[PDB]
Amino acid sequence: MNLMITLLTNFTLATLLVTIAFWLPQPFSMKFFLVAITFLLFDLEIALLLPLPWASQTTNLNTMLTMALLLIFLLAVSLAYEWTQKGLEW
């Protein structure tokens, strides 16, 4: 409840800022869309990667090393696939 009270105080102070600021002075491109989903899939593979340092202390290191490098290898494979198959070109 500590950080919730801090969040509440900051929200109330910001709303007081807005009320003093206001009540007191009285088509597309398809090539845009590939950025969002490509970011989304890179960020999902980030979500797969990022609990890696918690696993840095167990009795399995070779299998973990090989599969983690396999995951970044596959991320680079997807990168090279869209990189060579005009997925991000202009």
Binding site: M30, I37, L40, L41, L44, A47
Partner: protein, 98 residues
């Protein structure tokens, strides 16, 4: 029985009715599917946390990443629909009659 479980199940069924009935836009339907996804996420994660089921805690993050990529595919298909038509309605789908 942890009465909050009943609330998240009722929230699931609310989001399911929001998925099923939808008038005009498909974006509201797909967004209620995402809310239903959030519901299953919260329900499973609270169960596994409070039960101290520490071994197979893969479920929240895996359900997360997979139904997220499903939502990404659905948004891509909706972009294809709105590109080949004027709107993205349940209307203008009267072709391919049954």
């Amino acid at each position: 029985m942890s009465l909050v479980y009943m609330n998240i199940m009722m929230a699931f069924t609310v989001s399911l009715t929001g998925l099923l009935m939808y008038r005009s836009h498909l974006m509201s339907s797909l967004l209620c599917l995402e809310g239903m996804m959030l519901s299953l996420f919260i329900l499973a994660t609270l169960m596994i946390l409070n039960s101290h089921f520490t071994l197979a805690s893969m479920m929240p993050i895996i359900l997360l990443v997979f139904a997220a990529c499903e939502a990404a595919l659905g948004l891509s298909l909706l972009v294809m629909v709105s590109n080949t038509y004027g709107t993205d309605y349940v209307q203008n789908l009267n072709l391919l009659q049954c």
